Design a binder for this molecule. Structure first.
Ligand SMILES: OC[C@H]1O[C@@H](O[C@H]2[C@H](O)[C@@H](O)[C@H](O[C@H]3[C@H](O)[C@@H](O)[C@H](O[C@H]4[C@H](O)[C@@H](O)[C@H](O[C@H]5[C@H](O)[C@@H](O)[C@H](O)O[C@@H]5CO)O[C@@H]4CO)O[C@@H]3CO)O[C@@H]2CO)[C@H](O)[C@@H](O)[C@@H]1O
Length: 305
């Protein structure tokens, strides 16, 4: 059932092997497979988030020219998604950092975002994601970086697209109200800001263990974020979530999605972490046809597709 505006999967791989910059395609990183994206589209997903490294797209200086090969493959991936009618989220998977240093220049970040947005300005099914999971950095800077991204995107004439903004504390939903209240002041002339939060279900919320705290931990961890969105007249998306292929996690996943389904005045949907071609036996692999989550979790996501 078409419960949410957006329901889909991350398509990870282009950000793999980040210790090697620029690194080598086919050895350090790989782009998503359009054929397996088609399969997930056939299952009813309509949004695919595509991580990539800023340093690989725009080397040495974020204000510089794109790397032709890496950009060409980003373009190809985005077009493979949007040509089918689905939404493609362009996600610089960079944690608010560039060459492992916090991005402290909003002006530099705005130029980076004009450069990226210019490549996709006429495509209304592209979604721009300012940066993945800002963390351990100045709270006002996170606000200013998100605004600079919005400004750069709209300055390129990319005005039809939604913009996913992300907050501090790894943009966690469960930590949102404790640190990210200032994010309410972001402005967009297109009025298409979506607050992208992430929520994992293991004890520390890192999403590194297949064990979930309890059968209700997901719905508990997004309640205050839901109220924050409603109180501030904002819209949100869960841009990453996952749980292990086990009984407790299946119930936590459905409980949290069932809760968002009764709160769609603020929740636009949810995006699983993650599919992609190099996950192998990853505990959360949504990659068709043999990913653990593709085999064992996707059946419980049927009511939302
Ligand atoms: O296919 C054959 C091919 O293999 C090449 O070598 C591969 C190797 O086979 C892969 O196992 C390896 O894969 C690892 C990636 O290098 C690494 O980047 C990736 O890191 C993951 C991490 O495991 C995961 O926890 C993390 O999730 C977080 C999100 O990123 C955050 O946004 C969110 O906040 O929290 C979640 C949960 O913590 O994601 C990152 C990626 O973003 O882990 C992979 C598995 O270990 O890659 C090698 C290449 O780099 C070989 O070189 C080729 O020759 C060969 O053909």
């Amino acid at each position: 059932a078409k419960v949410f505006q957006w329901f889909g999967s991350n398509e990870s791989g282009a950000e793999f092997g980040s210790q090697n910059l620029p690194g080598v395609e086919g050895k350090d990183y790989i782009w998503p497979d359009p054929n397996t994206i088609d399969t997930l589209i056939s299952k009813g997903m309509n949004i695919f988030r595509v991580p990539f490294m800023m340093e690989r797209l725009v080397p040495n200086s974020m204000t510089g020219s794109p790397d032709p090969n890496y950009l060409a493959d980003l373009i190809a991936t985005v077009n493979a998604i949007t040509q089918k009618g689905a939404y493609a989220v362009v996600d610089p998977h960079n944690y608010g950092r560039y060459y492992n240093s916090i991005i402290s220049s909003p002006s530099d970040f705005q130029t980076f975002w004009k450069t990226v947005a210019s490549q996709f300005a006429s495509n209304p099914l592209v979604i721009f994601d300012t940066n993945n999971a800002y963390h351990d950095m100045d709270q006002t800077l996170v606000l200013n970086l998100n605004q600079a991204a919005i400004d750069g995107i709209r300055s390129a004439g990319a005005t039809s697209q939604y913009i996913f903004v992300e907050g501090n504390s790894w943009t966690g939903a469960w930590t949102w109200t404790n640190v990210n209240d200032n994010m309410k002041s972001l402005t967009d002339p297109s009025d298409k800001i979506i607050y992208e939060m992430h929520q994992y279900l293991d004890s520390d919320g890192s999403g590194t263990s297949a064990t979930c705290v309890s059968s209700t931990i997901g719905q508990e961890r997004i309640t205050s974020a839901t109220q924050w969105l409603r109180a501030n007249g904002k819209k949100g998306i869960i841009g990453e979530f996952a749980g292990g292929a086990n009984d407790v996690c299946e119930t936590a996943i459905t409980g949290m999605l069932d809760y968002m389904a009764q709160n769609t005045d603020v929740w636009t949907g949810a995006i699983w972490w993650a599919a992609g071609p190099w996950w192998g036996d990853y505990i959360f692999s949504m990659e068709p046809d043999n990913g653990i989550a593709y085999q064992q979790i996707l059946p419980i996501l049927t009511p939302y597709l």
